[PDB]
RNA sequence: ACCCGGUGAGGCGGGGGGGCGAGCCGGGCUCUCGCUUCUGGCGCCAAGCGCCCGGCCGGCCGGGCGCGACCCGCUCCGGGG
RNA sequence: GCGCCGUUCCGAAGGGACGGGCGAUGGCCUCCGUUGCCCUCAGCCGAUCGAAAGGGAGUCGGGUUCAGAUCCCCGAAUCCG
């Protein structure tokens, strides 16, 4: 049935035997400039020891609790540039013949009315690139009493509103239908973030070497904890 | 608002967060360029006491000057 | 008074290397996975005389292991290395004259 | 003759009818051709040799 | 997508043409070197009458920003005649003195006699 | 952080898989190895296996992916610091 | 600071070409070129200048002028596209 002609011939690729195979060398690219500049910053952020001010970013509110903050800012997403024009035209047709609560995007805003103490929960962005913007809004927070969230990515907080990007947007004032789920998330992000600041503080960041050194560190301490195990028994 | 909380937390240089957050972007600029833009200032509240503003025209270059 | 012979051999454009019919330069192989761990083979095409040098150099053809070109080499020939001889080169490499 | 002589004369004059046209001499190319085909029967006797060392071992 | 080579080069991305939305000038400048223009005037010397009597040609002084073919061309089109070739030179006086073999079906000293020259 | 060397930055570090040695009662455990040395030959653009679908009439013709060619990684490997 | 160093050195340094797929045109829309996109392939070495004695394909004879002749005329070839 089968052709006897249809000869199985392995290459033995020995060292020195036969010539190598085009296999994956992502590890060995000569990468540019930029790419191995942002690749080594972030292994510095992973190396230098970083202060808890910044350290603070680090710890992001979990998924279940995003998806229904994001739920919940859908509801309150302020006005389009299209919809501005339509209500523009719907109050000159009225003319012819109570505004509701949206939200306050901005860093200034948001301070302005956590000083005012009109915020009910206050999402940050962890991601912003200069990020001397947003180190202070956590602590003024922490003594304004309002309950502060982080989240990953300003995009995706960026594209709540009809904008690119979006550091830190204020809940100030919900309709009756929102305000039970706003207490349940309130009380969550309190209790992650207002009980539990003064252990973010204490908390200091970084210190983490690289994995090749760890396991070198890790085998010489493994073989002198067999040494001083097997000389007692 | 916030521009003040940003302007004495960039005054207070002698922190640590401050002396990180220069020993981290002088690395980073020493490995960029001599002469490159940079599209968003480092410094928004000093570029605006300046006399910068976020509109189309307004370019900020980075450049570095060798020391002595 | 004027500028000393020292001082001017230092600037260049007289005292500079006379480079012109010389072959190349004398390196030895980059590391790899052959010079690392196992051993790889190259002939010896021919020995020549270099200028400016009482060593004589040899032209050591070998295979390269990754892609299908024949590399060249300009090795120091040391004495006692024939032309038609396998010089191996690597960590699993014997010990004899013309052997790295 | 000089090289850029060569598009002018035909495919024959160029080269011989051989193995190695043009390229090696006939003694170099049948040496070539008793080195290929005994450093293989060196490695089939060797392919044997480990066999039967498996064989015994 | 796997790496094969360990070289990372610049990728072949996408340019456009030059889609202009107005032109750089107004109009197209017109052919500063015509016919008439690149042919100043034929020769009346004896050493040119001896050679357009002898070896079928014609003797004329060209602008010296011309070509061969323009000269040929020129010849064609401005005399009604065939041209066999064109052997062009630069005189100390400045001009290209252009002596155009022509085909022998027509004769130089017939084409000469009705263009003027003798 | 900073400096030097090599590269066309080509297999770096751990965890797997297999074989060769020692001791204990088929089993785990400490270590080495990973295919090339009698010869002036040749060696690339996949063989083999599996899973797919496209067209034509169990058969015909043209393609893709994974094994072969282990996995996870955070500095290209080293040398100073 | 006019600019200077530096020629492979702290570079994303290619616009190239084989084959396949898709649409748009051109010509007895047969069959093929031309461009547009995608897949795929690729090492090079430094932009550029630098010898009228270096390397460098291919022309010789006779005749002609007051001055030009491997150039003009005649007869023979020859190189490249
Ligand atoms: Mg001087
Ligand atoms: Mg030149
Ligand atoms: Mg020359």
């Not at chain 2, 020993?23 to 002469?35: E, H, T």
């Not at chain 5, 400048?29 to 002898?54: C, G, Q, V, W």
Request: charged fraction near 30%; include cysteine.
């Amino acid at each position: 049935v089968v052709n006897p002609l249809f000869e199985k011939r392995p290459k033995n690729f020995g060292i020195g035997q036969d010539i190598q195979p085009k296999r994956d060398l992502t590890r060995f690219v000569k990468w540019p400039r930029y790419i191995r500049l942002q690749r080594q910053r972030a292994i510095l952020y992973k190396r230098l020891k970083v202060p808890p001010a910044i350290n603070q970013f680090t710890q992001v509110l979990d998924r279940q609790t995003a998806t229904q903050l994001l739920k919940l800012a859908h509801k309150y997403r302020p006005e389009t540039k299209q919809e501005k024009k339509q209500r523009l035209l719907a109050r000159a047709e009225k003319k012819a013949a109570k505004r509701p609560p949206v939200l306050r995007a901005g860093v200034n805003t948001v301070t302005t009315l956590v000083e005012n103490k009109k915020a009910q929960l206050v999402v940050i962005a962890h991601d912003v690139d200069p990020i001397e913007l947003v180190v202070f809004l956590p602590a003024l927070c922490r003594k304004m009493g309002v309950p502060y969230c982080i989240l990953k990515g300003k995009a995706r907080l960026g594209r709540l509103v009809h904008r690119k990007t979006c550091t830190t947007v204020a809940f100030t004032q919900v309709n009756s239908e929102d305000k039970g789920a706003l207490a349940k998330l309130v009380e969550a992000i309190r209790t992650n973030y207002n009980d539990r600041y003064d252990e973010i503080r204490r908390h200091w960041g970084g210190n983490v070497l690289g994995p090749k050194s760890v396991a070198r560190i890790a085998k010489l301490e493994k073989a002198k904890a067999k040494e001083l195990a097997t000389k007692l028994g | 608002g916030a521009y003040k909380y940003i302007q004495e937390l960039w005054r207070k240089k002698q922190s640590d967060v401050m002396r990180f957050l220069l020993r981290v972007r002088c690395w980073q600029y020493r490995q960029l360029s001599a002469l490159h833009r940079a599209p968003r200032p480092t410094r928004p509240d000093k570029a605006r006491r300046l006399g910068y503003k976020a509109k189309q025209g307004y370019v900020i270059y980075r450049i570095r000057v060798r020391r002595g | 008074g004027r500028v000393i012979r020292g001082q001017r051999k230092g600037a260049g454009s007289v005292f500079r290397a006379h480079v012109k019919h010389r072959k190349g330069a004398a390196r030895l192989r980059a590391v790899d996975f052959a010079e690392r761990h196992g051993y790889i083979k190259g002939i010896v095409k021919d020995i020549i005389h270099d200028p400016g040098r009482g060593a004589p150099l040899a032209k050591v053809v070998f295979r390269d292991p990754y892609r299908f070109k024949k590399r060249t080499e300009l090795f120091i020939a040391a004495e006692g290395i024939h032309t038609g001889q396998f010089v191996y080169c690597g960590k699993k490499a014997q010990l004899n004259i013309g052997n790295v | 003759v000089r090289p850029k002589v060569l598009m002018r004369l035909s495919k024959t004059k160029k080269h011989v009818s051989r193995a190695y046209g043009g390229s090696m001499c006939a003694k170099c190319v049948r040496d070539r051709i008793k080195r290929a085909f005994l450093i293989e029967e060196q490695k089939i006797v060797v392919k044997v040799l480990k066999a039967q060392a498996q064989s015994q071992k | 997508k796997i790496r094969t080579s360990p070289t990372f080069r610049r990728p072949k991305t996408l340019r456009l043409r030059r889609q202009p939305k107005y032109p750089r000038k107004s109009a197209p400048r017109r052919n500063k070197l015509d016919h008439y223009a690149i042919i100043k005037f034929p020769l009346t010397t004896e050493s040119a009458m001896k050679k357009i009597e002898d070896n079928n040609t014609l003797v004329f002084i060209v602008d010296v920003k011309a070509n061969k073919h323009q000269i040929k061309q020129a010849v064609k089109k401005l005399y009604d005649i065939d041209v066999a070739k064109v052997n062009t030179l630069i005189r100390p006086d400045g001009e290209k003195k252009a002596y155009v073999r022509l085909a022998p079906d027509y004769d130089a000293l017939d084409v000469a006699n009705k263009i003027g020259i003798i």
